[PDB]
Amino acid sequence: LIPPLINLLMSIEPDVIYAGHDNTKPDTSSSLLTSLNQLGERQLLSVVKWSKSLPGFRNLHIDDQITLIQYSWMSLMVFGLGWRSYKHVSGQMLYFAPDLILNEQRMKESSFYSLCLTMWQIPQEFVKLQVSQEEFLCMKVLLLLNTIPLEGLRSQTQFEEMRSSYIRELIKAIGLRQKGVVSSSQRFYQLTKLLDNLHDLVKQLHLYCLNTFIQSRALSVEFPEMMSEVIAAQLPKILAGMVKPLLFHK
Numbered sequence: 001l002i003p004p005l006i007n008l009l010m011s012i013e014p015d016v017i018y019a020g021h022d023n024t025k026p027d028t029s030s031s032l033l034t035s036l037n038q039l040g041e042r043q044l045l046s047v048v049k050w051s052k053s054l055p056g057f058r059n060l061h062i063d064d065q066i067t068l069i070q071y072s073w074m075s076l077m078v079f080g081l082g083w084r085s086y087k088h089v090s091g092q093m094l095y096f097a098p099d100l101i102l103n104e105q106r107m108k109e110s111s112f113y114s115l116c117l118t119m120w121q122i123p124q125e126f127v128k129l130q131v132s133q134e135e136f137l138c139m140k141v142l143l144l145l146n147t148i149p150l151e152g153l154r155s156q157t158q159f160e161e162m163r164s165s166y167i168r169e170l171i172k173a174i175g176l177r178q179k180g181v182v183s184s185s186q187r188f189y190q191l192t193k194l195l196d197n198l199h200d201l202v203k204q205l206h207l208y209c210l211n212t213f214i215q216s217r218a219l220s221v222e223f224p225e226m227m228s229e230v231i232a233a234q235l236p237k238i239l240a241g242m243v244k245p246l247l248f249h250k
């Protein structure tokens, strides 16, 4: 049977989120990126809502809650994109939303094919490892908790306890299918290594983001309110490496 914290995590997952994209018109770089940013804003709002229901999170200092959301949003978005692509189209298209799906041809015709290929890595990796929903749910929490300030958090003690709790929960999730101690220990390494490796992929997305934000008027790319807020709040600092990424391994 499923451990209760994992069942809770499944129950607080966001519903389907639409981009609001107009698919009756041919793609342009402006229109596609603008629609992705509108989808982004909606997903960001859902992350905030989810975080209010996430066990432990509300008990961190409010300033730590804001910081963790501001540090982790890109990671959470691309991880979710990977999962949706894996679950709905067998990993073979980028499933941003039910109304915004990029097959490879649409990726190629875009102005950001290379970015698409970088993002397309994650679902191909989920296909490879056959990530379970229970593993995904725990891993996604750990991504929320995977970078802290250089000076640490105000609620550092509670944060450490929360993070450790979800790491123990991931171990329980692995235990649902992987019977055997050797396989289970190796799977822990693999999933946590995948999380370590996401830091590098996300850095590429962060650089793209900040360049796009700076150039948004010239590119005719709209950045909505909360997205602009989180970018302005922390993105240069994150890109500069003036934060502490938490690594599971060397």
Ligand SMILES: Cc1noc(C)c1-c1ccc(CNS(=O)(=O)c2c(C)nn(C)c2Cl)cc1
Residues within 6 Å of the ligand: 032, 033, 034, 036, 037, 039, 040, 043, 074, 077, 078, 081, 096, 119, 205, 208, 209, 210, 212, 213
């Ligand atoms: C939404 C969504 N789903 O997966 C990913 C990745 C996103 C996402 C993540 C970040 C942003 C912020 N803007 S951006 O960095 O210029 C950008 C745009 C526009 N599209 N993408 C994929 C990025 Cl990154 C917009 C969309």
